[PDB]
């Protein structure tokens, strides 16, 4: 006979939250400001190596970043010592990026013109989930608050028959580059009404007007604005593993998660065969 407080599941304790705070946040919510977060740690630097991309709601007061990071490091099956050593570094890295996310200008400054202005940029993808690599490029307008990256990524991955890893990677990449442009614009003097771009390094990256006779795309360009999924050998895989500026756009190569089922994860786990 005993009194046992609980039985650990996966060598973890159950999460118990405050329900009054839950209802307080849920009943006074207005917006869903989302921050794209990128984690990158090398070994010939801080001792561990880890790469990941993530989306985080900034108007969130319920979950502490320390708990989230501890859980995440438990998911990657890190040893106790390494986790207790590096949770602080990871938490600081995540906490910095939230603070420098001022936000979407066309929202905090009320513009919302139902079609936006015509500021259009090129969004370039390079995603290396698995042994394949998706390379793509397409035009995206950043004045319109109707453009939702999740639906677009979902549609593309349905039309090319890709798994969910590509969906989340594409959504994150779209949001990241859109915010890079928002930030570079608001950093310099730019009131987001009355377009008048009034600069030189940008206004050279936006895409020109589309009046007509320009709606149809030349053949030399149609090859550029089309997706490709190239499978890469072991040597180029290892090369890609080893190796706000707008010139260089970060790629996505996440370290695999130890999962038996999901695509893009390693299979070091209790086998489906139950012995």
């Amino acid at each position: 006979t005993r009194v046992i407080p609980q039985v650990e599941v996966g060598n973890r304790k159950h999460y118990l939250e405050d329900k009054l705070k839950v209802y307080k946040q849920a009943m006074n919510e207005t917006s869903e400001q989302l921050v794209p977060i990128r984690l990158e740690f090398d070994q010939d630097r801080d001792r561990f190596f880890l790469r990941d991309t993530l989306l985080w709601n900034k108007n969130d007061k319920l979950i502490k970043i320390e708990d989230f990071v501890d859980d995440m490091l438990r998911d990657y099956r890190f040893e106790d010592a390494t986790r207790e050593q590096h949770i602080d570094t990871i938490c600081q890295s995540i906490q910095e990026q939230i603070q420098e996310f001022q936000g979407n200008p066309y929202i905090e400054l009320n513009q919302d013109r139902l079609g936006g202005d015509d500021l259009r940029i090129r969004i370039k993808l390079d995603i290396v989930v698995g042994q394949n690599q998706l390379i793509d490029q397409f035009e995206w307008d950043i004045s319109n608050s109707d453009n939702c990256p999740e639906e677009f990524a979902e549609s593309m991955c349905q039309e090319l028959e890709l798994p969910g890893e590509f969906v989340t990677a594409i959504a994150h990449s779209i949001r990241e580059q859109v915010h890079m442009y928002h930030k570079s614009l608001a950093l310099l003097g730019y009131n987001f009404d009355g377009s008048a771009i009034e600069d030189d390094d940008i206004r050279s990256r936006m895409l020109p007007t589309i009046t007509l006779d320009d709606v149809y795309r030349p053949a030399a360009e149609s090859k550029i604005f089309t997706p490709n999924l190239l499978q890469i050998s072991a040597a180029e895989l290892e090369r890609l593993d080893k190796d706000p500026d707008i010139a260089d756009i970060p790629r996505t190569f996440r370290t695999p998660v130890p999962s038996t089922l999901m695509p893009g994860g390693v299979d070091v786990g209790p086998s489906v065969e139950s012995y």
């Binding site: 407080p5 609980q6 118990l16 109707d146 639906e151």
Partner: protein
Amino acid sequence: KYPELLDSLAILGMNLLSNLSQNVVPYHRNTSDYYTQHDKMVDKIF
């Protein structure tokens, strides 16, 4: 080592007191117990 237990008890008690004061019985209710803006504009026009 497991504090939420207390909350459970108290919360349960509270509801019972309510049901006792208003002459309601919570069990075997004979009820069910279950339950982008552009796209919505489009299908609403539809």
